[PDB]
Amino acid sequence: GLRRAEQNTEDGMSLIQTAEGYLQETHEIVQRVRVLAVQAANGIYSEEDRQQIQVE
C-alpha cells in the first residue's frame, strides 16, 4: 500500500501540474488585454481605430 499510495501521489501531482499548465496561457492573454486597454483609453483615437482594438 505504501508503494502504491506513493504512485497515486506521483500522478496526483501530475494532475495539478497539467492544470496549472493551461492556466499559464490564460494569465498571458488577460495581460494582453491589460496592455491594449491602456492604449485604448487614450484621447487621440477615433472610433475606427478603437474598434480595431476591439477586434483583437
Distance (Å, rounded) from C-alpha 29 to C-alpha 23?
A: 10
Residue with cell 506513493: 6
Please give the residues from 1 up to 56 whose contact with another protein meets the rule CB under 8 A: 2-3, 5-6, 9-11, 14-15, 17-18, 21-22, 24-25
Quick one: 2 or 30, whose CB is closer to another protein?
2
Quick one: 24 or 46, whose CB is closer to another protein?
24
53 CB contacts (<8 Å, ≥6 apart)? 36, 39, 40
- Residues making contact with another protein (CB under 8 A): 2-3, 5-6, 9-11, 14-15, 17-18, 21-22, 24-25
